[PDB]
Amino acid sequence: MERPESELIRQSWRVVSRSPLEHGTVLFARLFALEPSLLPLFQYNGRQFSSPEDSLSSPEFLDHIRKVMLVIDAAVTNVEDLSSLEEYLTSLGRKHRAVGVRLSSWSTVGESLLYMLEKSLGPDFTPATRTAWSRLYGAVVQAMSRGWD
Ligand code: HEM
């Protein structure tokens, strides 16, 4: 990730980072709207969520969203030199393994992240901004993939 894209990522993330659960709530609502077959992957207290709105009522799931947003925040923090996060990201890929699932739906999660950013930023979601985030997301998924394999 080069310099120009890096300030773009930082600037755009500031808004998000002020209310991470409200934003991650959009990401996951979008995710389950696009691919409801991912809903059963998130099971707490020996229960499957029936509908996407059920997931938003689960404190365990909302806490999961906060973890996701904290990891994206760590990626933003290290956007200039990710290799600093490489080991952690490989360990995160290992975690998915695993608990049970592949990362074959990585693009859908990526499009849900970009959806949340588009909706939050509005006119500030420039072509340059989208491209920067797509590349950052791609870099994170690659490190996680090294994890998993
Ligand atoms: C490729 C599609 C993905 C799927 C289907 C998926 C699904 C899941 C599932 C089922 C869990 C376990 C939930 C639980 O039992 O609480 C999980 C954990 C997690 N995921 Fe994802 N995930 C994907 C990609 C990602 C990406 C791209 C990131 C971040 C950039 C991410 C960050 C996390 C974090 C931080 C956890 C918690 C890890 C821990 O407890 O140590 N995931 N994911």
From Swiss-Prot:
PROSITE patterns, A to Z: GLOBIN
A Pfam cross-reference name: Globin
Gene Ontology BP term (one): cellular response to hypoxia
Catalytic activity: Fe(III)-heme b-[protein] + nitric oxide + H2O = Fe(II)-heme b-[protein] + nitrite + 2 H(+)
Keywords assigned: Cytoplasm, Disulfide bond, Heme, Iron, Metal-binding, Mitochondrion, Oxidoreductase, Phosphoprotein
Residues that hold heme b according to the record: H64, H96
Induction text: Up-regulated upon oxygen-glucose deprivation.
Residues spanning the membrane: none
Root EC class: oxidoreductase
Annotated compartments: Cytoplasm, Cytosol; Mitochondrion matrix
A GO term for molecular function: nitrite reductase activity
Tissue: Predominantly expressed in brain.
Modification after translation (UniProt): Phosphorylated during hypoxia by ERK1/ERK2. Phosphorylation regulates the heme pocket hexacoordination preventing the association of His-64 with the heme metal center. Thereby, promotes the access of dioxygen and nitrite to the heme and stimulates the nitrite reductase activity. Phosphorylation during hypoxia is stabilized by 14-3-3 proteins.
Domain Globin: 1-149
Main subcellular location of this protein, as a coarse class: cytoplasm
One cellular-component annotation, GO: cytosol
EC number: 1.7.-.-
Assembly notes: Monomer. Homodimer and homotetramer; disulfide-linked. Mainly monomeric but also detected as part of homodimers and homotetramers. Interacts with 14-3-3 proteins; regulates the phosphorylation of NGB. Could interact (ferrous form) with G-alpha(i) proteins (GTP-bound form).
Its biological purpose: Monomeric globin with a bis-histidyl six-coordinate heme-iron atom through which it can bind dioxygen, carbon monoxide and nitric oxide. Could help transport oxygen and increase its availability to the metabolically active neuronal tissues, though its low quantity in tissues as well as its high affinity for dioxygen, which may limit its oxygen-releasing ability, argue against it. The ferrous/deoxygenated form exhibits a nitrite reductase activity and it could produce nitric oxide which in turn inhibits cellular respiration in response to hypoxia.
Family according to the record: Belongs to the globin family.
Name this protein carries in UniProt: Neuroglobin
Organism: Mus musculus (Mouse)
Gene: Ngb
